[PDB]
Design a protein around this ligand. Structure first.
Ligand SMILES: [Mg+2]
Ligand SMILES: [Zn+2]
Lengths: 126, 23, 136, 37, 176, 133, 192
RNA sequence: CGAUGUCGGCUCGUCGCAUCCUGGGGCUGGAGCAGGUCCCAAGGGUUGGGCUGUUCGCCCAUUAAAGCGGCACGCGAGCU
RNA sequence: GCCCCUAAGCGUGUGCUAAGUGGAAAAGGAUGUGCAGUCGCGAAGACAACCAGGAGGUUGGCUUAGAAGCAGCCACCCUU
């Protein structure tokens, strides 16, 4: 990868975050691309599922007050934006995690706030 | 040819300056 | 197996191995070439072997030039003969090669097999040689 | 064990090392095992 | 270098000392000493560790740095935890058992081959085909392991002989 | 855990299915009869089957859609593919057949939209050397 | 199109001759001579490393500006003497040029693209010469060989040129020749 | 050239290893028996006859094997 | 030429060699080492190791007994 390609990635993630009301960070450890294809089927209809460099999303997060999510990037990070609504991705992710036992709900982001696993599950319960 | 080789290489001394009779 | 059609004089003094080459020192028809780093008479059997080796490693495509032609004859006396009684009879054809001379020339699409064929040819020659290319 | 003036890494698993002042080629394939001598 | 710059941590249950170049470590499993190369300086990190330092940068010092660090780590591990290695025997009619402290093998020879137990090494056979070699020193454990392993010539056809725990030998086919 | 492509109308083949099915403990006859019943209901083309195995030796057959290459062959009307793809063209396909096969690959595939399967089948036709029009 | 001249420092030779030139080359310098329409040959010595860097970066016909004891002089590399074995530079002929002067210089021709898989591309003329303004000599000329079938000849007149450059050598000079790939059997009788 | 006796055989050896046997190994298109090839190794051993002046060679019986060479093609003030 | 034999320096300063190279040798083979110079990537985390993946289409077609990403020829694509 090059610096220009990396910067294009930063701009793309920045615009994707600007285009989404919420974002949820989870874990994809021990997942097969078949499972990822199923998740993409179940999400891309309404949501958007992405993965990138943790540091590159750190550079994409310096735009708005989302620098507080850097602590949640320790380990693999899967980015799920919500272009339609804000909770369908959270519910689908939680069901996928319960089904595969391989996805650990790292965190979320709501109303300009970074929440814990329990808070995100409560919000999904709302 | 060890004998001839030894003589012809002995030509290469510092005192002989790289030349000797019968080379 | 290259032999001149005719020569004006069949028996000649040996070619001189003095100095370095002044003509044919750059690659001109192909993309890569073989350059000599020593003085040596190079016979037509050696040229044949090197040409065959390059052709074998290059297979279908590519074109090969031989800028060196063995037109200088060497003679040898019949065996078990004392000295004297005239000069021998011509039975080798060689070409005098000075350092800086570009011997063979290759034009092939890919660099790896181009250089590999050139090395295969070099291993059949009696000289130290290197591979050169058009760019300075 | 092949003992020749020339030793080379026949395959992609061959490693060239130097033991006790001798150049050797060591491979998981015993055929490819060779030393310089 | 990169190995030489990572200090070894020292658990609480092991006693260490530095007497010039010599170094001795006492632990639950026993006492083991070491003497290190002259250019290399060994110390005691006050935070409960050992720091190795090469004052120069030449090849000899750069090589001894990593070697010294790894030997020190092995030294602390040997007394803290101990080393053990297991073997399995393959082939029909091949067995093993303890004749007291010694090891007795049945490898097809006209006589049974007995393997003596050197100092600091203790065997423990659990199955007539599976046993283990344990000890406090990694070098001695590896040596006795190799000597036991070479008791039969390699057999690429049937595989009969002594193997390590997870070793995958090479095999071929004799059609005739 | 093996997969195969096999003719619909006949069971117990010699080359492909026999030995591979055998070395997996699958009952040959019951699979043959069930596959023959399903493929006589189908009666379109040959069908690919995936073999899934269990510890109780029970066998489950996975029957997918007719092969895309075979569907393109029937749509182009030719039997054997072009020996020099992109260098000699044996037949031409209009977008109706390509889109029918695209719907087939949508039903059998992960594609979100029929356009993805249409371009997949266009790539298949490129691989065969068959023009898509 | 314009090329910024490359800055170089040159010192007048105190002593000229074979031994003096050998000494200067031993100190990593390159002797050279400067002449031109002014009719006044000046004998100089240039640093080998920076001169080699300039030539490597901007081809074999590079515009230079020479600081000779504070005087700035524009020059163009007319010719280079290279030892065939050591491939160093032994001598350089620098031509005095001013702005708005037409010169006739070789320019290398390189080919790019990919022709038919069943064809072999042969380049007959490594370099061609053109008439161009001294400050706007093109670094190189390029001929694209794509979609070229069987025996097709690309000559000098068919070479695209920048604006303000004139091709002086005749257009019939064959530069690139595309031919059918020689068969495996056709390589066994050429050269015997 | 005011003389350095010449081929085979006998007798007596002595040295090299480029090893024939015995000894130690690596890779095998090494299942075993038996091999093939390469590396190490000179301690000892390395047969008797038919034909030929013969060296050499072919052959007959064996043997673990029936090694290759240098020493004025070792050795005639030792023999023929 | 200058440690002792053997007259005069186990001379001074700055580096190199680990081969007794010095104190014999070729084509060629080689992660020996010192110096000088180019090009690639890299804290927006490079290389090595490690963990998790590395699919579906589809076994792409010709071709055979066979062709399944890997006897052989061709193009050599699409989604996530
Ligand atoms: Mg050569
Ligand atoms: Zn190998």
């Amino acid at each position: 990868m090059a610096k220009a390609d990396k910067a294009t990635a930063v701009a793309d993630i920045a615009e994707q975050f600007k285009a989404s009301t919420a974002t949820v960070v989870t874990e994809y450890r021990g997942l097969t691309v078949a499972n990822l294809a199923e998740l993409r089927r179940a999400l891309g209809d309404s949501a958007t599922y992405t993965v990138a460099k943790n540091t590159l999303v750190k550079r994409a997060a310096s735009e708005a007050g989302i620098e507080g999510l850097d602590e949640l990037f320790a380990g693999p990070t899967a980015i799920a934006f919500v272009k339609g609504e804000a909770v369908d991705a959270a519910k689908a992710i939680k069901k996928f995690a319960k089904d595969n036992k391989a996805l650990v709900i790292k965190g979320g982001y709501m109303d300009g706030k970074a929440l814990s696993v329990a808070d995100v599950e409560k919000i999904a319960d709302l | 040819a060890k004998r001839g080789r030894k003589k012809r290489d002995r030509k290469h001394s510092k005192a002989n300056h790289g030349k000797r009779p019968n080379a | 197996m290259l032999i001149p059609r005719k020569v004006k004089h069949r028996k000649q003094h040996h070619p001189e191995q003095r100095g370095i080459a002044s003509g044919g020192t750059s690659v001109s028809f192909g993309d890569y070439g073989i350059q000599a780093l020593e003085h040596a008479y190079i016979t037509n059997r050696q040229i044949e072997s090197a040409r065959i080796a390059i052709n074998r490693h290059i297979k279908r495509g590519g074109k090969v030039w031989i800028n060196i032609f063995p037109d200088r004859p060497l003679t040898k006396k019949p065996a078990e003969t004392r000295m004297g009684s005239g000069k021998g009879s011509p039975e080798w054809w060689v070409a005098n090669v000075k350092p800086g001379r570009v011997l063979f020339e290759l034009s092939y699409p890919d660099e790896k097999t181009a250089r590999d064929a050139l090395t295969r040819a070099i291993h059949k020659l009696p000289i130290k040689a290197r591979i050169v290319t058009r760019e300075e | 064990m092949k003992v020749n003036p020339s030793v080379k890494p026949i395959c992609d698993k061959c490693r060239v090392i130097r033991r006790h002042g001798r150049v050797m080629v060591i491979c998981s394939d015993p055929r490819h095992k060779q030393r310089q001598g | 270098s990169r190995i030489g710059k990572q200090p070894v941590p020292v658990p609480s249950g092991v006693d260490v000392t530095i007497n010039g170049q010599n170094l001795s470590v006492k632990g639950p499993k026993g006492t083991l000493t070491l003497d290190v190369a002259e250019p290399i300086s060994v110390s005691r990190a006050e935070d409960g560790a050992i720091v190795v330092t090469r004052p120069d940068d030449e090849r000899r010092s750069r090589s001894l740095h990593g070697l010294s660090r790894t030997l020190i780590a092995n030294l602390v591990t040997g007394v803290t935890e101990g080393y053990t290695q297991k073997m399995e025997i393959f082939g029909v009619g091949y067995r093993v058992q303890l004749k007291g402290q010694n090891l007795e093998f049945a490898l097809g020879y006209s006589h049974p081959v007995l393997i003596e137990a050197p100092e600091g090494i203790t065997f423990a056979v659990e199955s007539p085909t599976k046993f283990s070699v344990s000890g406090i020193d990694k070098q001695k454990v590896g040596q006795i392991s190799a000597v036991i392993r070479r008791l039969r010539r390699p057999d690429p056809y049937k595989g009969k002989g002594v193997r390590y725990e997870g070793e995958q030998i090479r095999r071929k086919v004799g059609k005739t | 855990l093996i997969k195969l492509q096999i003719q619909a109308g006949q069971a117990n083949p010699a080359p492909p299915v026999g030995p591979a099915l055998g070395q997996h403990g699958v009952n040959i006859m019951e699979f043959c009869k069930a596959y023959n019943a399903a493929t006589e209901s189908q009666r379109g083309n040959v069908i690919p089957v995936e073999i899934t195995v269990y510890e109780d030796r029970s066998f489950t057959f996975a029957l997918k859609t007719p092969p895309a290459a075979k569907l393109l062959l029937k749509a182009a009307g030719v039997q054997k593919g072009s020996g020099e793809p992109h260098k000699t063209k044996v037949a031409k396909v209009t977008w109706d057949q390509v889109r029918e096969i695209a719907e087939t690959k949508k039903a059998d595939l992960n594609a979100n939209d029929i356009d993805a399967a249409a371009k997949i089948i266009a790539g298949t036709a490129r691989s065969m050397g068959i023009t898509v029009e | 199109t314009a090329n910024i001249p490359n800055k170089l420092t040159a010192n007048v030779r105190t002593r000229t001759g074979k031994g003096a030139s050998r000494q200067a080359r031993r100190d990593g310098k390159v002797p050279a001579v400067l002449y031109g329409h002014g009719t006044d040959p000046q004998h100089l010595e240039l640093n080998a490393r920076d001169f080699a860097a300039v030539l490597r970066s901007h081809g074999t016909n590079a515009i230079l500006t020479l600081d000779i004891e504070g005087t700035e002089q524009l020059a163009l590399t007319k010719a280079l003497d290279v030892h065939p074995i050591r491939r160093n530079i032994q001598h350089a002929d620098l031509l005095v040029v001013q702005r708005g002067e037409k010169v006739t210089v070789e320019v290398t021709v390189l080919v790019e693209g990919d022709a038919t898989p069943g064809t072999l591309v042969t380049q007959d003329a490594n370099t061609i010469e053109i008439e161009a303004e001294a400050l706007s000599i093109p670094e190189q000329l390029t001929v694209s060989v794509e979609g070229v079938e069987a025996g097709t000849q690309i000559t000098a007149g068919q070479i695209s040129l920048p604006e303000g450059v004139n091709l002086i050598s005749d257009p019939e000079l064959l530069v690139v020749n595309v031919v059918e790939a020689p068969s495996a059997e056709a390589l066994e009788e050429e050269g015997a």
